[PDB]
Amino acid sequence: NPLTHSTPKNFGIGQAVQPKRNLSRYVKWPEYVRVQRQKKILSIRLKVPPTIAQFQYTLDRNTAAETFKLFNKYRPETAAEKKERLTKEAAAVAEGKSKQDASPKPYAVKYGLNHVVALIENKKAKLVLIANDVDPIELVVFLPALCKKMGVPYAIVKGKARLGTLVNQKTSAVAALTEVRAEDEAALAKLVSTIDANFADKYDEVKKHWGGGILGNKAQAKMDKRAKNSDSA
């Protein structure tokens, strides 16, 4: 205690060359990192036409959790399940001359963009989930309007990766329920009511609101200062 002493460093300008500080704000990031960040920035700095930026409204966390909880009860067959079904079907129809009906009618989430679009056009879909992060957005921009025209309840949900985990893929970009079981029919009706309250009933209003137009941090501060000076005086 008497041998050690306090020697505070003067980290001001011109003394005691600066200590190591968190410079992550100033990191010269790789070109791909800078490009993806600046693309995300530009997509909101520009004025986003109302057909886009309807995807900035995603299902809230609780309704999304309920939706994926319901959809997880209708996962499509895996490789092992399909192999087991194929064995239990072939080895049964061969012995008993069955009409390939040794398996029950399947209830699975419908996925695939073309398949789901055709189901929407044929009014088979009872609940369509559209991923909010389809990188070429033209694939799903018409989907809210197609669902609205065909009277199909649709929800813009966060995660094509989440829909992929729903359908045993990496990504699915869509997920649809056309037929639901009796024990989940009431849950489907309540979920569809909430989803229509959030997306389908608001479509005619969100169709007239342009997105984006959001300034950066420093431009926002500058405009706040100029409004505080010129406007409030």
Under the rule (CB under 8 A), what is the footprint of another protein? 12-14, 17-18, 20-24, 26-31, 35, 38-39, 42-43, 46-52, 113-114, 117-118, 135-142, 146
Q: H or E element: which one contains 130?
A: strand 127-131
How far is it, in rounded angstroms, from Cα 132 to Cα 155? Answer: 10
Q: Give one word for 168, left, alpha or beta, with left for phi > 0 and alpha for psi -120 to 50.
A: left
Q: How many CB atoms lie within 10 A of CB 31?
A: 8
Q: Which is nearer to another protein, 19 or 104 (CB)?
A: 19
Interaction pattern, residues 167-206, with RNA; x per rule: CB under 7 A = ----------------------------------------
Task: Find the part of the chain contacting RNA (CB under 7 A) among 21-29, 96-104, 163-171, 180-188.
Answer: 21-29
Are the C-beta atoms of residues 140 and 174 closer than 8 Å to each other? yes
49 binds RNA (CB under 7 A): no
230 binds RNA (CB under 7 A): no
222 binds, among RNA, another protein, none (CB under 5 to 8 A by kind): RNA
CA R_g for the chain: 27
Q: How many residues bind RNA (CB under 7 A)?
A: 46
6 binds, among another protein, RNA, none (CB under 5 to 8 A by kind): RNA
Closest C-alpha to 57, from 192, 227, 195: 195
List 108, 140, 217, 227, residue binding RNA (CB under 7 A): 217
Q: Is residue 44 packed enough to be buried (19+ CB in 10 Å), middle (13-18) or exposed (0-12)? A: middle
99 binds RNA (CB under 7 A): no
